Design a protein around this ligand. Structure first.
Ligand SMILES: *SCC1=CC(C)(C)N(O)C1(C)C
Ligand SMILES: [Cl-]
Length: 162
């Protein structure tokens, strides 16, 4: 298991524009296009991201290219962030994947707001961090996925995903 397979499991793969759990226009492997309610705005974003006139449908190769870029961006967002970098640096390789998963889903700003959870992770208080992590809009809106990411933080294994 690795971060790409992990996020592939959580985000799925759709080759046509769809609405994510929040109702936002999205495509491929959880690639957010826009928060605007306009399908045309979304198609325009898609054409721009892919570099061709798509009409809302992309290929698997294109979905995967967007995915590669998004994972790379998430990782680099963490490394450039002053609240996130220290936590990442302190974690083992499995739990690092968990952090990348959160950032991928809710953004660098969003994760950096889990101030208390981040401090417990740095101290390696896994059970305590798990409980604090569950007290969140994130957990209540997407329980199954949050559970998987939280269990990963708690155990340091890939068991939530096998
Ligand atoms: S999060 C899943 C999990 C963690 C731990 C506390 C080690 N468990 O006993 C289960 C398998 C419930
Ligand atoms: Cl879910």
């Amino acid at each position: 298991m690795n971060i790409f397979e992990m996020l592939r499991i959580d985000e799925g793969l759709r080759l046509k524009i769809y609405k994510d759990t929040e109702g936002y226009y999205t495509i491929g492997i959880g690639h957010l296009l826009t928060k605007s309610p306009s399908l045309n705005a979304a198609k325009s974003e898609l054409d721009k991201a892919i570099g061709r006139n798509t009409n809302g449908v992309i290929t698997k190769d294109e979905a995967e290219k967007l995915f590669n870029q998004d994972v790379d961006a998430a990782v680099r967002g963490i490394l450039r962030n002053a609240k996130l970098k220290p936590v990442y640096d302190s974690l083992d390789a499995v739990r690092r994947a968990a952090l990348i998963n959160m950032v991928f889903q809710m953004g660098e700003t969003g994760v950096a707001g889990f101030t208390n959870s981040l401090r417990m992770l740095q101290q390696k208080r896994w059970d305590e961090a798990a409980v604090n992590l569950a007290k969140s809009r994130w957990y209540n809106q997407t329980p199954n996925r949050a559970k998987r990411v939280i269990c990963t933080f708690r155990t340091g294994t890939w068991d939530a995903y096998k």
